[PDB]
Assembly symmetry: C2
Homo-oligomer: 100 residues x 2
């Protein structure tokens, strides 16, 4: 453990995505709802969470009875260092099948 | 680790109260809300966590 200094040498189970984090993002959406009541002046909320699994990114969409981000920002096409027909297909189908 | 057999010898960070558990309890409350709309017939939900 004297040599564990790089971030990729640990599993970050205690410092990222803890119980209660999504409720803080939902209270940000509630604060912005008081400025969205006038028609044509809806206020947008997007979230950025990168280097993440697709099943954790999709949780920022919320639930059908609980509002959260309007969308989380999708950067999975930006992470393609080389392009191919199979690699573009799996990025498009991962987002469309996993999002609610 | 061959002798770790009692439940009190581990910290249960991965098997109790995970991310997403409270949302399952909130969806139980939403199911019971469809039977609570008539006045005087509210449906109670209590949770036990000791």
């Amino acid at each position: 453990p004297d040599t564990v200094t790089q971030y990729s040498e640990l599993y970050h189970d205690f410092t990222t995505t803890q119980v209660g984090m999504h409720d803080i993002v939902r209270s940000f959406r509630q604060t912005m709802d008081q400025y969205s009541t006038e028609p044509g002046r809806y206020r947008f909320m997007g979230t950025e969470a990168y280097a993440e699994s697709i099943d954790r990114t999709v949780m920022y969409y919320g639930l059908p009875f609980i509002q959260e981000a309007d969308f989380p920002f999708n950067n999975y096409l930006s992470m393609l260092d080389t392009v191919s027909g199979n690699s573009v297909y799996e990025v498009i189908t991962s987002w469309m099948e996993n999002m609610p």
